[PDB]
Amino acid sequence: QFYSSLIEEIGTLGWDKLVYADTCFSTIKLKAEDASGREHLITLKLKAKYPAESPDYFVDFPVPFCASWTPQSSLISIYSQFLAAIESLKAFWDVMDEIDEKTWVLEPEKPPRSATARRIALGNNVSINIEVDPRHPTMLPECFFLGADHVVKPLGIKLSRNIHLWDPENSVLQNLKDVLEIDFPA
Amino acid sequence: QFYSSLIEEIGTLGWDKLVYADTCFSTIKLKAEDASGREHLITLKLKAKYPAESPDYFVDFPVPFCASWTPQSSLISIYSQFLAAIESLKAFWDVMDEIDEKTWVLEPEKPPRSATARRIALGNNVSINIEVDPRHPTMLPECFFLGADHVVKPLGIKLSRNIHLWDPENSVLQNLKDVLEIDFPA
Amino acid sequence: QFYSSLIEEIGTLGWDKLVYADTCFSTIKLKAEDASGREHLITLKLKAKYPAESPDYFVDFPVPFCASWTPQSSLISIYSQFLAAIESLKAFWDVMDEIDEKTWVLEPEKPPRSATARRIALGNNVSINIEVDPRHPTMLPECFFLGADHVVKPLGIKLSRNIHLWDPENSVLQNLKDVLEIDFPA
Amino acid sequence: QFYSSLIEEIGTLGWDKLVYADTCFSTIKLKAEDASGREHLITLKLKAKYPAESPDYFVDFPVPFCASWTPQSSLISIYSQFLAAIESLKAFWDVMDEIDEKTWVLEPEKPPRSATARRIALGNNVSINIEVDPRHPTMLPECFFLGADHVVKPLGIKLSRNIHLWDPENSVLQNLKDVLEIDFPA
Numbered sequence: 001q002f003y004s005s006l007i008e009e010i011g012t013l014g015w016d017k018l019v020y021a022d023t024c025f026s027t028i029k030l031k032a033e034d035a036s037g038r039e040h041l042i043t044l045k046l047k048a049k050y051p052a053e054s055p056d057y058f059v060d061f062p063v064p065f066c067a068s069w070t071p072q073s074s075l076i077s078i079y080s081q082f083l084a085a086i087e088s089l090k091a092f093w094d095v096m097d098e099i100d101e102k103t104w105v106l107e108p109e110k111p112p113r114s115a116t117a118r119r120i121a122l123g124n125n126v127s128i129n130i131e132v133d134p135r136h137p138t139m140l141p142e143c144f145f146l147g148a149d150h151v152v153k154p155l156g157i158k159l160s161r162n163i164h165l166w167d168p169e170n171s172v173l174q175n176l177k178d179v180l181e182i183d184f185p186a
Numbered sequence: 187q188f189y190s191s192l193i194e195e196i197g198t199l200g201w202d203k204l205v206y207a208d209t210c211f212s213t214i215k216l217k218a219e220d221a222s223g224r225e226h227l228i229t230l231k232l233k234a235k236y237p238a239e240s241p242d243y244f245v246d247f248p249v250p251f252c253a254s255w256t257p258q259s260s261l262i263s264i265y266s267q268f269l270a271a272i273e274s275l276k277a278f279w280d281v282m283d284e285i286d287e288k289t290w291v292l293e294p295e296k297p298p299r300s301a302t303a304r305r306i307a308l309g310n311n312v313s314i315n316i317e318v319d320p321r322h323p324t325m326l327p328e329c330f331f332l333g334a335d336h337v338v339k340p341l342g343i344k345l346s347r348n349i350h351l352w353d354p355e356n357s358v359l360q361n362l363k364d365v366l367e368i369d370f371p372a
Numbered sequence: 373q374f375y376s377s378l379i380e381e382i383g384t385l386g387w388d389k390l391v392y393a394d395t396c397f398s399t400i401k402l403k404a405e406d407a408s409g410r411e412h413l414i415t416l417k418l419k420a421k422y423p424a425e426s427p428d429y430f431v432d433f434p435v436p437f438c439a440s441w442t443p444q445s446s447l448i449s450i451y452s453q454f455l456a457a458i459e460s461l462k463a464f465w466d467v468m469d470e471i472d473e474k475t476w477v478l479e480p481e482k483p484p485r486s487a488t489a490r491r492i493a494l495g496n497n498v499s500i501n502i503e504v505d506p507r508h509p510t511m512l513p514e515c516f517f518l519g520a521d522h523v524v525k526p527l528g529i530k531l532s533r534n535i536h537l538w539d540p541e542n543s544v545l546q547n548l549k550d551v552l553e554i555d556f557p558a
Numbered sequence: 559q560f561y562s563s564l565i566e567e568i569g570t571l572g573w574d575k576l577v578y579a580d581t582c583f584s585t586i587k588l589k590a591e592d593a594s595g596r597e598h599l600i601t602l603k604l605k606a607k608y609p610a611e612s613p614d615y616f617v618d619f620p621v622p623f624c625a626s627w628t629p630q631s632s633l634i635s636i637y638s639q640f641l642a643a644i645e646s647l648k649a650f651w652d653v654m655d656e657i658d659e660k661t662w663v664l665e666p667e668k669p670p671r672s673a674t675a676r677r678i679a680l681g682n683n684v685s686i687n688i689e690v691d692p693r694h695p696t697m698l699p700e701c702f703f704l705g706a707d708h709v710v711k712p713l714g715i716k717l718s719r720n721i722h723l724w725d726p727e728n729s730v731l732q733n734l735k736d737v738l739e740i741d742f743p744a
C-alpha cells in the first residue's frame with residue numbers, strides 16, 4: 001500500500017478526529033468531544049518503531065493517564081482508553097465548569113482541564129481557596145479562607161457548624177452557598 | 187513526481203479541515219465553519235489526473251457553485267472560493283435559522299442548507315408557504331396560505347393591507363409578524 | 373510517517389526488478405534472472421501494516437520457501453533470500469532444462485519450475501517416468517516404465533544391468549542414455 | 559489519489575516497461591523489445607508541468623524521433639510512437655546486426671543503434687567503409703575503399719561491373735560478397 005499502519009489507523013478512527021499532524025506525521029493530535037460537549041485533545045509523538053514501540057502521548061487531565069498493556073501498541077486502543085478516562089472525569093469537569101461560569105475566579109487565570117484548585121473571590125479582599133478531588137468532585141473540597149479574621153473566622157465557624165448540610169448530590173458551588181450562607185460575586 | 191500533491195495541500199489547509207477520506211483518498215470531505223458558527227461541508231472526488239483534471243465536488247447551497255479551476259489550483263484554491271460563497275450567503279442562512287428556531291416548520295422536516303422554501307404552521311388549521319430568494323433574502327418572498335377560507339381570509343386582508351410596512355432591515359420572520367399582526371406557534 | 377517505505381524499497385531494489393503492480397500497490401511482482409539466464413518471479417501481497425506484518429508471497433519452486441522476516445526487513449531482504457534459494461536450485465533446473473530441451477516430454481505439457489516429475493516418451497509405445505529430488509538432482513531418480521511387456525522388458529534388463537554406471541557428475545539425461553543404452557526421440 | 563498522473567500512466571503501460579526512475583521520478587527510462595528480440599530504451603525527463611508541457615525524451619535511433627501533436631502530452635501515446643518507429647527500423651537493424659555478427663568491424667567500437675556507418679576489415683591493411691541509409695537499408699550503401707591501389711582499384715572495377723547483381727531482397731553483407739567477389743574475415 002502507499003500508506004503506513006498509522007494512516008490506516010487514523011482512517012479507522014475517522015479523519016474528523018485528527019486535528020493536527022506535522023509534515024512527517026511524527027506528531028499528531030486527536031480530538032474527542034465528551035458526552036457533555038467539551039473538547040479534549042491528546043497529542044501523540046510517534047517513533048520510528050511505531051507500532052512496536054509505544055508512542056509518547058500527552059493529555060490535559062487532573063489525574064495520570066497511562067496506556068498499553070498490549071504486546072504491540074494501537075492508536076485505536078489508546079484513543080478508547082482516552083475516551084473512557086474522559087467519561088470517568090465528567091463529574092469533575094461538570095463541577096469546575098459551573099464554578100468557572102458562575103463565580104469570580106482569581107486563580108488560576110485560564111484554568112486548564114488539569115487544574116484541581118480554584119481561588120474564588122468572595123468580596124472586598126476576601127477569597128476562598130478550594131482544592132477539588134477529581135475522583136470525588138462533589139464531596140467537601142479542601143477549603144482555605146484568605147482574608148482578615150473579622151470575615152474569615154465566622155466563615156470557619158459556619159463551615160464547622162453547617163458541614164452536615166453538605167450534600168454530595170449537589171454541586172460544589174451549591175453546597176458552598178448553603179454551608180457558608182453566602183453569595184458569590186459574579 | 188511519484189506522489190500526488192493532495193496530501194501536501196491538505197497539510198497546508200490544515201488537517202483539522204479534513205473530516206472524511208476514503209482509503210485511497212479518492213473521496214474527501216472538508217469542513218468550514220462560517221462567521222456565524224454554522225458548519226458547511228464540501229465533498230470532493232479526485233482522480234489520479236488531479237490537478238490537471240478538476241475534482242468533482244458537491245456542496246449544500248441554495249445556489250449553484252462552480253469553482254474556477256486550472257492545473258495551478260489546489261485544495262486551498264477551491265476551499266477559498268467555497269468560503270467566499272458561504273460568507274456571501276450569511277444573510278440567507280440567518281433568515282432561515284431564525285424561522286427554523288422560532289416557528290413550527292411543517293416542510294421541510296430537516297431542511298438542508300439548500301432549501302429555500304418553508305411551510306410554516308400558523309395554527310392547526312392554516313399555514314403559510316414562503317419561498318426565499320437566497321440572493322435577496324429580506325425582500326418580500328413569494329407566499330401563499332393554505333387553510334379554509336374563513337381562517338385565511340382575515341390573514342389575506344391584513345397582508346395586502348400592511349404589505350407596505352415590509353422592512354428589509356428586519357428579518358423575514360419579524361416582517362411577517364408585523365404584516366400579519368400575529369404570533370407564530372413555537 | 374505518512375507513506376509506507378514500500379516505494380523507497382523498490383527504488384533501492386531497482387525499478388527494473390518490478391514487473392507488475394496493481395493500482396494500490398497491494399500486489400507486486402519482482403523478477404530475478406539467475407546466473408544461468410532463467411527468469412523467476414516472486415509475487416508479494418502487502419498490507420498497510422507492512423513491514424510490521426510480513427507480506428504474503430508466492431514463488432514457483434520445487435521446494436518450500438519461507439522467508440525470515442521481522443519489522444526490520446524490506447523488499448531487499450526477502451528478495452535476497454529469494455535469490456539465494458534460486459542459486460541453490462541451479463543444478464535442479466539445469467537437469468530439467470536439458471530434459472525439456474532434448475527429449476519428448478509427455479508430462480507436464482508446459483512444466484512450471486516447481487515440477488519435479490517428467491514422463492518421457494522412449495517411442496510411440498513406451499515411456500519412462502522420472503521423479504527428481506531437487507536437493508539431489510543428479511542421483512538416481514525414482515523411475516518406472518509404461519508400455520507393453522515386450523517393449524519394456526529389454527529396457528528393464530539393461531537398467532538393472534547398468535545401474536552401477538550412474539555418474540552424478542553427469543546430467544540425468546546422459547546417465548539414462550548410458551544406463552538404457554538408447555536414443556531419446558526429440 | 560496518493561499517486562500522480564504519471565504513475566497511473568506507468569501502471570497502464572505496465573511496470574515491466576519501467577527500467578529506471580530517479581527518486582523524484584523526474585527522469586525515467588522505458589524499455590521496448592522489438593519483434594526481432596532487440597531491446598530499445600527511451601529516456602524521458604518530466605518537468606513540473608507534465609502532462610501539460612511535453613517531456614524531453616532521448617532515444618538511440620539512426621533517424622530523428624518526434625512526438626505529440628496533441629494538446630496535452632501522454633506517456634502512453636509517446637511509447638506507442640516509439641514502438642512504431644522501432645518497427646519501422648527493423649530492416650535497418652537486421653542489416654547492421656548481421657554485419658556486426660559476421661564481419662570484422664574496425665569502427666565504430668561498440669556501435670550504438672544510431673550508427674549508420676561501419677568500417678569493415680577485408681584483409682591485411684584493407685578495409686571498406688559503408689554508409690547505410692536507415693530508411694532503405696538493403697540498397698547499395700555508399701562504399702569507400704581504404705587501402706593501396708593494387709587491392710582497391712580492382713575492387714572498384716568489380717563494384718562497377720557487377721553492380722547489376724545487387725539484390726535489395728538480400729542483406730547488405732550478402733550483396734557485398736556477391737558484387738565484390740570476396741570473403742570477409744571473421
Ligand code: PRO
Pocket residue numbers: 247248249300301302303
Ligand atoms: O430554489 C432553490 O434554489 C432551492 C435549491 C434546492 C431546492 N430549492
Ligand code: PRO
Pocket residue numbers: 290371372
Ligand atoms: O406547537 C405545536 O403545538 C406543535 C405540535 C407538534 C410540535 N409543535
Ligand code: PRO
Pocket residue numbers: 433434435486487488489
Ligand atoms: O515434489 C515436488 O516437490 C514437486 C512440487 C510440485 C509438485 N511436485
Ligand code: PRO
Pocket residue numbers: 476557558
Ligand atoms: O518426436 C516425435 O515424433 C513427437 C511427435 C509429436 C511431437 N514430437
Ligand code: NA
Pocket residue numbers: 015016017018019201202203204205
Ligand atoms: Na481532521
Ligand code: NA
Pocket residue numbers: 163164165166167
Ligand atoms: Na451531609
Ligand code: NA
Pocket residue numbers: 387388389390391573574575576577
Ligand atoms: Na519495471
Ligand code: NA
Pocket residue numbers: 721722723724725
Ligand atoms: Na540489381
